[PDB]
Design a protein around this ligand. Sequence first.
Ligand SMILES: [Mg+2]
Ligand SMILES: [Zn+2]
Length: 324
Amino acid sequence: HMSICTSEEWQGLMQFTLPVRLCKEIELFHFDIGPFENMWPGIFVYMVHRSCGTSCFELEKLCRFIMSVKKNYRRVPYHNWKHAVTVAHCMYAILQNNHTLFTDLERKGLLIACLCHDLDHRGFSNSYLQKFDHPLAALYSTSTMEQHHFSQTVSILQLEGHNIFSTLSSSEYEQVLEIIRKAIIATDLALYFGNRKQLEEMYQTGSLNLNNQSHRDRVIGLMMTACDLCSVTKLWPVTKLTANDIYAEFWAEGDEMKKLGIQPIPMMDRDKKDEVPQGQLGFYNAVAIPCYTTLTQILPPTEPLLKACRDNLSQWEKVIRGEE
Ligand SMILES: [Mg+2]
Ligand SMILES: [Zn+2]
């Protein structure tokens, strides 16, 4: 049940050279991949090499993994192949600015987990699949699609020559799958709120501590929500265009509810276009600013994410004022 990538796809990826004017701009947080669609797989290659190293993964295997991941993502409006790399790039930019704070096995896990973090997303949220007794929701009582994303991640590895972790020992093999599993479940927004409050509680008292493993996982969890929502940290017109992709997936999910007879939540109602700016304003205050505030407190050189989020909050505030 996994789409195997062709030789022509991953061969052309090995041969790919990164343009020198992108080598500079890849490092910056605000960097928008959007314009360079044909270059995306090779930009993930570059990001792995710059963080982990050239001999980190066997280049032939890594290129099969990437192009088979791309093939397993569906063509929904938002949770798609484009999303995977934008989130994986945010992680890269964080990891670069806090490098020896994490291990090489963590670096391997989090980028790979970011690129696979929404594998085979059907366009539909957890609550929709749970409320209409979907086979996936029966399989996973809490965090439905996130567990499916982790399952699809592990299925890709088990294909012929796709297992990038063959050269690791089985000690570090089950560690990297546990880092990846933990990181992919953290992306379920439901758990972020508890995760943030806890880390805020741990920060202010002074009891937070990086080699305390339980704290380390919460810190990695926050990074995976900061990355998963990183479209709010981009430039203003990029962010406006991305939210239009996000709502297009919400409104299709809301169309499916109106057919069955039950009217959806206003966020997934396409008649409620008027509420969007006020709905964003809420999202930035109760989720986004909070996410990047406690991120900047743990890791000071992830402040640009918080800075550009303040900037985009101002723009969303101005849209309610009637300026735009
Ligand atoms: Mg998700
Ligand atoms: Zn996501």
